[PDB]
Design an enzyme around this catalytic site. Structure first.
Site, mmCIF file in Angstrom:
data_model
loop_
_atom_site.group_PDB
_atom_site.id
_atom_site.type_symbol
_atom_site.label_atom_id
_atom_site.label_comp_id
_atom_site.label_asym_id
_atom_site.label_seq_id
_atom_site.Cartn_x
_atom_site.Cartn_y
_atom_site.Cartn_z
ATOM 1 N N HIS A 1 0.739 -1.051 -0.088
ATOM 2 C CA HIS A 1 0.260 -0.315 -0.350
ATOM 3 C C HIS A 1 0.528 0.697 0.111
ATOM 4 O O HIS A 1 1.841 1.189 0.786
ATOM 5 C CB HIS A 1 -0.988 -0.024 0.658
ATOM 6 C CG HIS A 1 -1.825 1.163 1.359
ATOM 7 N ND1 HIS A 1 -2.983 1.324 0.239
ATOM 8 C CD2 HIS A 1 -1.793 2.677 2.106
ATOM 9 C CE1 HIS A 1 -3.368 2.483 0.834
ATOM 10 N NE2 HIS A 1 -2.887 3.180 1.881
ATOM 11 N N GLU B 1 2.541 10.726 -3.386
ATOM 12 C CA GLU B 1 4.257 10.183 -1.883
ATOM 13 C C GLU B 1 4.697 11.054 -2.212
ATOM 14 O O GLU B 1 5.586 11.475 -0.671
ATOM 15 C CB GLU B 1 4.151 8.464 -2.135
ATOM 16 C CG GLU B 1 4.444 8.227 -0.552
ATOM 17 C CD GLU B 1 3.350 7.402 -0.098
ATOM 18 O OE1 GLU B 1 2.330 7.235 -0.567
ATOM 19 O OE2 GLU B 1 3.701 8.412 1.028
ATOM 20 N N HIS C 1 -11.714 2.604 9.206
ATOM 21 C CA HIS C 1 -11.206 3.209 9.942
ATOM 22 C C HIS C 1 -12.157 2.828 11.510
ATOM 23 O O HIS C 1 -11.741 3.067 12.265
ATOM 24 C CB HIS C 1 -11.563 4.862 8.886
ATOM 25 C CG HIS C 1 -10.273 5.253 8.230
ATOM 26 N ND1 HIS C 1 -8.546 4.869 7.949
ATOM 27 C CD2 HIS C 1 -10.325 4.889 7.131
ATOM 28 C CE1 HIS C 1 -8.377 5.194 7.309
ATOM 29 N NE2 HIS C 1 -9.411 4.948 6.327
HETATM 30 ZN ZN LIG Z 1 -0.258 8.272 1.914
#
Ligand SMILES: [Zn+2]
Ligand SMILES: CC(=O)N[C@@H]1[C@@H](O)[C@H](O)[C@@H](CO)O[C@H]1O
Ligand SMILES: *[C@@H]1O[C@H](CO)[C@@H](O)[C@H](O)[C@H]1NC(C)=O
Ligand SMILES: *[C@@H]1O[C@H](CO)[C@@H](O)[C@H](O)[C@H]1NC(C)=O
Ligand SMILES: *[C@@H]1O[C@H](CO)[C@@H](O)[C@H](O)[C@H]1NC(C)=O
Ligand SMILES: *[C@@H]1O[C@H](CO)[C@@H](O)[C@H](O)[C@H]1NC(C)=O
Ligand SMILES: *[C@@H]1O[C@H](CO)[C@@H](O)[C@H](O)[C@H]1NC(C)=O
Ligand SMILES: *[C@@H]1O[C@H](CO)[C@@H](O)[C@H](O)[C@H]1NC(C)=O
Ligand SMILES: [Cl-]
EC number: 3.4.17.23
Lengths: 596, 194
Positions: free
Chosen positions: A326, A356, A486
């Site tokens: 991930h 990222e 979550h």
């Molecule tokens: Zn992220």
């Protein structure tokens, strides 16, 4: 002799020892991310135990410092972050009860398996349900699957959730919070800053104002969602009533990204697809990351240090060693930042690489700041700063400029219409659902609703706000929304909302500084180093001063606003307002698919 | 033509950290300075009281070389009239200092996977330093007006640890800094150049 200097000295320590321990822990975490062997599992189970023990001991030692005799705001916030005891404020029995039930949800959600009426096919949440939804269009399969998953996951996790609510309310009341909702509200709390103070309910009023300014957009786009789906499926969806729950494109209505194939307005135009041109030039992970570096140099941000390219894994390490990839990158620190994300030759990987890299640039930006402040000014900055880079790189002007799209090409009308739809249904679909889960957790911890009509009120105002109807009525013996990731592992959701609004605020400010003219979705931050310095002015700030000052350092406004949301989708919304001249706008809450 | 142990001061294996200023004395030497130029790509070569190229034409009485290990920021921190946790508590450089500073990186050499934890530095003393002072002062530091045996409630230990690892990116990769101290004072000059 005064408490301020004693606190400063203790902060010095906490800084240095926490740096050492956290570097150890996070380096061994990276060792997980690549080499998942059984021994390293142990290694940083002990390492995380050590880090937690040091954190607990330092917090216990710091509890002797009073906040009434401290004045330096940096010291104020460092001490306040130290003093959040969290679960340790309760008794040992209550703490172990809490953490064992946390482990129980972890196990159940990670292992929840559904047997079809033929028990042969054992299926899980991932990747089975993801494939079933985002690949198949059959009503019966979707309904049976999701209803079974809900009906068994709740049956195990309902009273567990009830006792979570009880114990979390107790914990919040212990920590001088009215409710656990105020505990999650405390992140945006800023005190001792004139013209910059913010309470716990001020953000609630802000979010309600955002509702007041956003509603017609989502009612209207819901109108097209139902219209197109009834064009595809006429006997299953009413033209005025709400859309049923199991037809939202993903597992729990969070993303409407899979509704593309059924909701593309003009299916004959070609979508922006550069992957073919990737194997045209045989691009690779090194090349794609170097292209990201060229981008971030064109915005005057600093380079990738040699340690990045030397030590981070950049492409899958064969089949001998298994890697869960991930797209992630955590803060080791001391310049030693690194990324693992499986690089395939695609555009989703390009977008995630830019995301990222936004993460990395933000994370290095506050490298000189102390340990308790080496984070985004709030929880919603890091991901928004990451995603703005992806959005900027997604425009075709960048693709033409870097030569990844043929220069003999002009912006095509119905293709960019589809493009706006792409970035629309991947974002606005998340908003009401994230808003709404967060409001229910607020009222759950507030206790305004008793134990016996949670689901009823949930689904009635699901009908009236999101336009979602249960395709099976469910009673109070259900806890359907707990099935999400979550909520199952105790993270907030306004992070997604703050990300979503803040990223458009930043993009608006940057394109205003970039002096870009014309359509705003075509704006690019390239060869715009003044805009880069503007961004860096906030990037370097971290958590030292309140997040609203950092937000002003880009936009000049102390509060979040909806104007970038409105302005970004303007020509889109003109096309759609001219399209709904022959369709109903709004939904009726009475209709359910089993009320015949 | 007796050469001076610049090679044996620049090629050791345990350069003592800031907290033991490890000062070597230079006399009856010839100061070959091509070794000061070719040795390592270097990272900091700021000279203050002596020109960095018009220096071989000078003859000096004594030269003091101190030999530490610091992180990236402290390398730029070492300068006349500076503040911080290394320029006020461990090593202070006089404002009237005349000489050159040398700072070149060493990781492969001094970091180590698993890590180093021997280079130890200091954080809190009672007062301010004086230039060129050693103070190995292993004295559990205190405050809070409850002076204590120590290492406890507001009882701190003066030293600290340099977590050194071979992957830290530049900014805190363990730099090796050695400072060259001269004096232009009337005396029998013993260290001349060729
Ligand atoms: Zn992220
Ligand atoms: C501390 C000091 O000033 N003198 C040191 C000496 O003790 C040490 O053995 C040598 C190599 O480490 O460098 C010099
Ligand atoms: C790689 O995995 C192996 C398992 O065979 C393990 O022994 C080794 O420590 C791992 N290396 C790293 C750098 O994680
Ligand atoms: C407050 O802390 C900052 C950062 O350490 C420091 O620069 C400043 O001098 C401090 N202010 C006071 C009054 O001590
Ligand atoms: C890119 O694709 C292949 C090469 O991979 C080849 O046809 C040509 O070079 C390019 N153009 C098209 C239309 O394929
Ligand atoms: C930025 O400038 C470089 C310099 O030639 C150019 O190659 C690149 O296309 C420019 N990017 C833009 C204008 O977006
Ligand atoms: C969109 O752009 C095309 C260019 O091919 C043009 O022919 C057309 O008139 C424009 N407007 C609409 C509504 O299609
Ligand atoms: C240190 O000395 C060894 C031999 O004793 C030599 O091989 C090495 O090159 C020297 N170090 C440097 C940096 O030249
Ligand atoms: Cl739902």
């Amino acid at each position: 002799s005064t408490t301020e200097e004693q606190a400063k000295t203790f902060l010095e320590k906490f800084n240095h020892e926490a740096e050492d321990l956290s570097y150890q822990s996070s380096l061994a975490s990276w060792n997980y991310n690549t080499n998942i062997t059984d021994e390293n599992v142990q290694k940083m189970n002990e390492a995380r135990a050590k880090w937690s023990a040091f954190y607990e001991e330092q917090s216990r030692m710091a509890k002797t410092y009073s906040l009434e005799e401290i004045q330096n705001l940096t010291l104020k916030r460092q001490l306040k972050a130290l003093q959040h005891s969290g679960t340790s404020a309760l008794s040992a029995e209550k703490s172990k009860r809490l953490n064992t039930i946390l482990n129980k949800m972890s196990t159940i959600y990670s292992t929840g398996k559904v047997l079809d009426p033929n028990t042969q096919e054992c299926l899980a949440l991932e990747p089975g349900l993801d494939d079933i939804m985002e690949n198949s269009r059959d009503y019966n399969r979707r309904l049976w699957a999701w209803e079974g998953w809900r009906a068994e996951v709740g049956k195990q996790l309902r009273p567990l959730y009830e006792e979570y609510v009880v114990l979390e309310n107790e914990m919040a009341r212990a920590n001088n919070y009215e409710d656990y909702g105020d505990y999650w509200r405390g992140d945006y709390e800023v005190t001792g800053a004139g013209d910059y103070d913010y309470s716990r309910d001020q953000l609630m009023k802000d979010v309600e104002r955002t509702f007041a300014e956003i509603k017609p957009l989502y009612e209207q786009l819901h109108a097209y969602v139902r219209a197109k789906l009834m064009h595809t499926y006429p006997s299953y969806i009413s033209p005025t009533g709400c859309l049923p729950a199991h037809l939202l494109g993903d597992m729990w209505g969070r993303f409407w990204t899979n509704l593309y194939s059924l909701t593309v307005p003009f299916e004959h135009k070609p979508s922006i697809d550069v992957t073919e041109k990737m194997e045209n030039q045989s691009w690779d992970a090194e090349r794609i990351f170097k292209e990201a570096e060229k981008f971030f140099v064109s915005i005057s941000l600093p380079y990738m240090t040699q340690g990045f390219w030397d030590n981070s894994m950049l492409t899958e390490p064969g089949d001998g060693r298994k890697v869960v990839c991930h797209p992630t990158a955590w803060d080791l620190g001391k310049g030693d930042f690194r990324i693992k994300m499986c690089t395939k030759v695609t555009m989703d990987d390009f977008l995630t690489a830019h995301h990222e890299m936004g993460h990395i640039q933000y994370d290095m930006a506050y490298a000189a700041q102390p340990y308790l402040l080496r984070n985004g000014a709030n929880e919603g900055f890091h991901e928004a700063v990451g995603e703005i880079m992806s959005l900027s790189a997604a425009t075709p002007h960048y693709l033409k400029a870097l030569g990844l799209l043929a220069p003999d090409f002009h912006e095509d009308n119905e293709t960019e219409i589809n493009f706006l739809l792409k970035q629309a249904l991947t974002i606005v679909g998340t908003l009401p659902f994230t808003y709404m889960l967060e409001k229910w957790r607020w009222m759950v911890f507030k206790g305004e609703i008793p134990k016996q009509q949670w689901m009823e009120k949930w689904w009635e105002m699901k009908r009236e706000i999101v336009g979602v109807v249960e395709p099976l009525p469910h009673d109070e013996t259900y806890c359907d929304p707990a099935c999400l990731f979550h909520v199952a592992e105790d993270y907030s959701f306004i992070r997604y909302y703050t990300r979503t609004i803040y990223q458009f605020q930043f993009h608006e400010a940057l394109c205003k500084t970039a002096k870009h003219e014309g359509a705003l979705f075509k704006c690019d931050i390239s060869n715009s180093t003044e805009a880069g310095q503007r961004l860096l002015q906030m990037l370097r700030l971290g958590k030292s001063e309140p997040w609203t000052l950092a937000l002003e350092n880009i936009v000049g406004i102390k509060t979040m606003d909806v104007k970038p949301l409105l302005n970004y989708f303007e020509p889109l919304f003109t096309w759609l307002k001219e399209q709904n001249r022959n369709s109903f706008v709004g939904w009726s809450t009475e209709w359910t698919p089993y009320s015949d | 033509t007796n050469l001076c142990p610049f090679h044996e001061v620049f090629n050791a294996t345990r350069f003592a950290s800031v907290y033991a200023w490890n000062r070597t004395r230079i006399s009856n030497c010839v100061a070959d300075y091509s070794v000061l130029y070719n040795f390592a790509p270097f990272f900091a070569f700021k000279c203050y009281g002596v020109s960095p190229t018009k220096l071989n034409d000078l003859c000096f009485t004594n030269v003091y070389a101190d030999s530490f290990v610091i992180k990236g920021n402290e390398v730029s921190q070492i300068a006349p009239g500076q503040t911080g946790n290394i320029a006020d508590y461990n090593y202070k450089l006089p404002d009237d200092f005349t000489g050159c500073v040398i700072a070149w990186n060493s990781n492969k050499l001094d970091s180590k996977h698993s890590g180093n934890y021997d280079y130890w530095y200091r954080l809190f003393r009672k007062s301010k330093l004086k230039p060129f002072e050693r103070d190995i002062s292993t004295e559990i530091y205190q405050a809070g007006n409850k002076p204590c045996k120590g290492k406890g409630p507001n009882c701190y230990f003066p030293l600290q640890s340099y977590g050194f690892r071979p992957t830290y990116g530049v900014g805190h990769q363990p730099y090796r800094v050695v400072v060259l101290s001269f004096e232009l004072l009337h005396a029998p000059a013993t260290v001349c150049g060729p």
